[PDB]
Design an enzyme around this catalytic site. Structure first.
Site, PDB file in Angstrom:
ATOM      1  CG  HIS A 196      10.850 100.919 -36.013  1.00 31.71           C
ATOM      2  ND1 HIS A 196       9.489 100.832 -35.714  1.00 31.71           N
ATOM      3  CD2 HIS A 196      11.544 100.629 -34.969  1.00 31.71           C
ATOM      4  CE1 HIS A 196       9.270 100.913 -34.194  1.00 31.71           C
ATOM      5  NE2 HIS A 196      10.481 100.668 -33.827  1.00 31.71           N
TER       6      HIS A 196
ATOM      7  CG  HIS B 199       8.298  96.898 -37.796  1.00 31.85           C
ATOM      8  ND1 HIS B 199       7.104  97.352 -38.694  1.00 31.85           N
ATOM      9  CD2 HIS B 199       8.706  97.918 -37.117  1.00 31.85           C
ATOM     10  CE1 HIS B 199       6.868  98.568 -38.352  1.00 31.85           C
ATOM     11  NE2 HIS B 199       7.807  98.994 -37.497  1.00 31.85           N
TER      12      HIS B 199
ATOM     13  CG  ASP C  48       6.410 100.624 -41.235  1.00 33.31           C
ATOM     14  OD1 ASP C  48       7.590 101.151 -41.149  1.00 33.31           O
ATOM     15  OD2 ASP C  48       5.382 100.756 -40.455  1.00 33.31           O
TER      16      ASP C  48
ATOM     17  CD  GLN D 143       4.976 104.871 -42.033  1.00 28.99           C
ATOM     18  OE1 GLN D 143       4.382 103.966 -41.481  1.00 28.99           O
ATOM     19  NE2 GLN D 143       5.560 105.543 -41.234  1.00 28.99           N
TER      20      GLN D 143
ATOM     21  CE  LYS E   4      17.619 109.061 -35.914  1.00 27.00           C
ATOM     22  NZ  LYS E   4      16.890 110.166 -36.642  1.00 27.00           N
TER      23      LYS E   4
HETATM   24 ZN   LIG Z   1       7.708 100.717 -36.865  1.00 25.26          ZN
END
Ligand SMILES: [Zn+2]
Ligand SMILES: [Zn+2]
Lengths: 465, 465
Positions: free
Chosen positions: B304, B160, B158, B156, B254
């Protein structure tokens, strides 16, 4: 001070016995022992290293690959041995079927070879050379774990080479040249007759067929390849060669790369990568068959090699031997910009120059930390910075720098282990940034020759100073 | 043709049901189902992608990190939930103690936050934004596995984000701008009112305290942040916004990124990354406490986000929507050099020009495949190349190109889905290489704006043609 201290200070890793805020428990009671957690200073080093090592290997003719992290144990059953090796592996279940967290890349790299042979047969060139910045996990007991040197998960500059008899001496010699290039150009470590040693570990002929597997032809073919390559190394650099009877692994002979270093004033070995011949894999994955049938080649060798070895381990020893001093490309903080305030109105031009140089360097892709300081504070600010953050380049901006239009610029000289002062003229902020960028480019130059591009992964690490 | 076919043809992955030479068993009976094995064409794509995505995030202000692949389950006990999540995890034992192959990066990224707070307290800037090209493993049943879309191990993009109330709208909006930049510049996919949709999933207010955890203040603060950002997105691009009551996860609302695509001539959604608020983590890791105590901040959000999502999944859909056609930077083969031999003596100049251009492009760091062809063979050689290898740029060198000193150069136009012919003059081989390199630089230009550097990871893939 150990690498454990330097790694924490440069913010390359999290210390396992540091307490977690509010919880007051050690980071290790969350993560597990032996699982190094790289931190904000360590992130760019890891991407930069992968990038340089991948491009360096691609330019030298290795195909770069990334292989999966888990695998069915069928994969490790076929390679061997496996009642033994089972014991160093983390195993787990999917769905009845036994799987492992990969402890080595070799089986995967051979599958990729086998896949290309299947699609392209003999059009595939030999030697076939595949390189991976690979992530491996092994069982280590709690009492075996030590810093970054012995850990449960780590990275290797791993490669596999399938080479016919007629090119094997050159391949061995080339790997040596690869080791020397990475050491000298990425790490600024000199490799010569005074600092380097090559160790050969060979069979005992009386035990071929028993403690050393394979045939005599195999062993002699490989041992001669290592002796010829070693003989060329010795002739070209006067590097001394050591040969040990009966120290080879059961599956083939090997060569080890050893740096000679000194305390204080003790002479010590720093063991690095290896060139390991393998007589087991070509039998277990039927490579001898495949190469004979598809290429008509009867004499072929299979080789595991790493230049650094474990990357965590190499970085650990490096931190100690160099007392925390990173080459520019790998330094968590590349330029530290230090505004030496005076109290007077010149502080406005000092603060604007520092700020603009800082933004300019960040735009060029550098890792930059700005520190506000004062004439009276300077001495102890710098001492704190040198004892902890160890920036690759310090740039001092005070009243004097503003009035004379010359920056005070201190690059760390890794050989002498001292700062060296440069006087860098500028007309204005833009121009100061160009001239600082030029200095950086000179410091990145050896890495550009390994990999074509020096990695710029920018970061604002002001908060660390 | 599915991505499974395109991935095998471009040599991005190994096909699991291909037979292993000499063994005749499928590759999957060695590796496990659901474990994608990237191949020689896929290796450079993976390094290139990591490199571009890491530098892109660093230039946008994220700290790039690499976190461990295994962890004590204490790490996942603290985050939740964990009687539930346990079931999607691969677990194993060290030495009595329970460990997991990481299924998510979030806990690790929060530890890094906590580590910096401990060392630097409030000197740490907020928003704190950490990015990882991260490798995650999850349990998937054998019947769930499909190509690259649903797999057991994947990557991912990804990140934060710990953001105070006063900057949260801007952060949400910025992530959207990040998605749009990566799509348009790395992938050459247009993002506009006709092709893109943003989906908001919100609480049911009647169920806050029960199926949606947390307080009303939390939910309203986050839902308003998503509505304001979405309102700016809609105003600037006319991109349409969809809002679903009661579809949020239990731990926060989200936003999902959705491309609108078409067959043939069916309109379909292609779901990408997400912006997920989290009310659970700041409680479980005591982030609310920490931010209040160290920064004096009462309104803070934890987020996230991924732009692509699963990288394997994104690459899969991409291969299908683009019928195997990669942007230049990510193309397994960047220049295909095609020598059109005639039988006559001009073949010597054709062969020397092709060979020199090929070596020159490799020296510049490109991925290059040379193919020997003939006037009569050309038609079916090209058809084979277009149906399989799909090189980013074809360079035709025949008698005509040699005599006129103009190369026949065909770049694939991703928007029109057609080759476009360029006539590139040269004086000699060196100059042809400069001019080809210039074309490549124009094709790399959008990636340079994301990441400063376009990755050159060279390879000789002649054997594939
Ligand atoms: Zn996460
Ligand atoms: Zn190996």
């Amino acid at each position: 001070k150990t690498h454990i201290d330097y790694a924490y200070e440069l913010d390359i890793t999290v210390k396992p016995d540091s307490r977690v805020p509010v919880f007051n428990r050690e980071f290790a009671t969350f993560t597990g022992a032996g699982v190094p957690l790289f931190s904000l200073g360590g992130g760019p080093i890891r991407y930069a290293l992968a990038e340089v090592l991948a491009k360096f290997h691609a330019r030298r003719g290795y195909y770069v690959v990334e292989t999966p992290i888990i695998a069915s144990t069928e994969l490790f059953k076929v390679s061997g041995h496996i009642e033994f090796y089972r014991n160093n592996m983390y195993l787990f279940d999917i769905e009845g079927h036994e799987f492992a967290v990969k402890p080595m890349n070799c089986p995967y790299h051979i599958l990729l070879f086998l896949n290309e042979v299947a699609k392209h047969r003999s059009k595939l060139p030999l030697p076939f050379k595949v390189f991976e910045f690979g992530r491996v996990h092994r069982y280590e007991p709690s009492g075996s774990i030590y810093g970054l040197l012995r850990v449960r998960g780590f990275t290797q500059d791993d490669a596999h080479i399938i080479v016919p008899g007629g090119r094997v001496i050159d391949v061995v010699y080339d790997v040596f040249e690869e080791m020397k290039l990475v050491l000298e150009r990425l790490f600024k470590l000199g490799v010569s007759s005074e600092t380097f040693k090559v160790r050969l570990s060979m069979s005992d002929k009386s035990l071929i067929g028993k403690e050393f597997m394979g045939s005599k032809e195999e062993w002699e073919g490989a041992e001669e390849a290592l002796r010829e390559a070693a003989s060329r190394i010795n002739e070209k650099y006067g590097i001394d060669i050591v040969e040990l009877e009966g120290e080879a692994a059961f599956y083939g002979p090997k060569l080890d790369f050893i740096m000679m270093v000194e305390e204080s004033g003790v002479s010590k070995e720093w063991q690095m990568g290896t060139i390991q011949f393998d007589f087991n894999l070509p039998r277990r994955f039927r490579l001898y068959d495949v190469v004979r049938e598809e290429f008509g080649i009867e004499e072929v060798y299979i080789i595991h090699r790493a230049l650094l070895g474990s990357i965590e381990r190499f970085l650990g020893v490096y931190l100690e031997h160099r007392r925390g001093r990173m080459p520019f490309t790998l330094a968590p903080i590349q330029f530290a910009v230090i505004a030496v305030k005076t109290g007077g109105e010149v502080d406005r031009e000092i603060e604007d120059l520092a700020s603009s140089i800082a933004k300019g360097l960040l735009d060029k892709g550098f890792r930059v930390a700005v520190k506000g300081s004062s004439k009276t504070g300077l001495s102890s600010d710098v001492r704190h910075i040198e004892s902890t953050a160890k920036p690759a380049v310090n740039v001092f901006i005070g009243a004097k720098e503003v009035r004379e239009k010359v920056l005070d610029v201190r690059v760390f000289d890794l050989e002498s282990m001292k700062r060296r002062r440069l006087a860098i003229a500028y007309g204005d902020a833009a121009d100061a940034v160009e001239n600082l960028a030029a200095v950086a480019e000179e410091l990145e130059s050896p890495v550009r020759s390994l990999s074509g591009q020096a990695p710029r992964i920018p970061a604002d690490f002001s908060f660390m100073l």
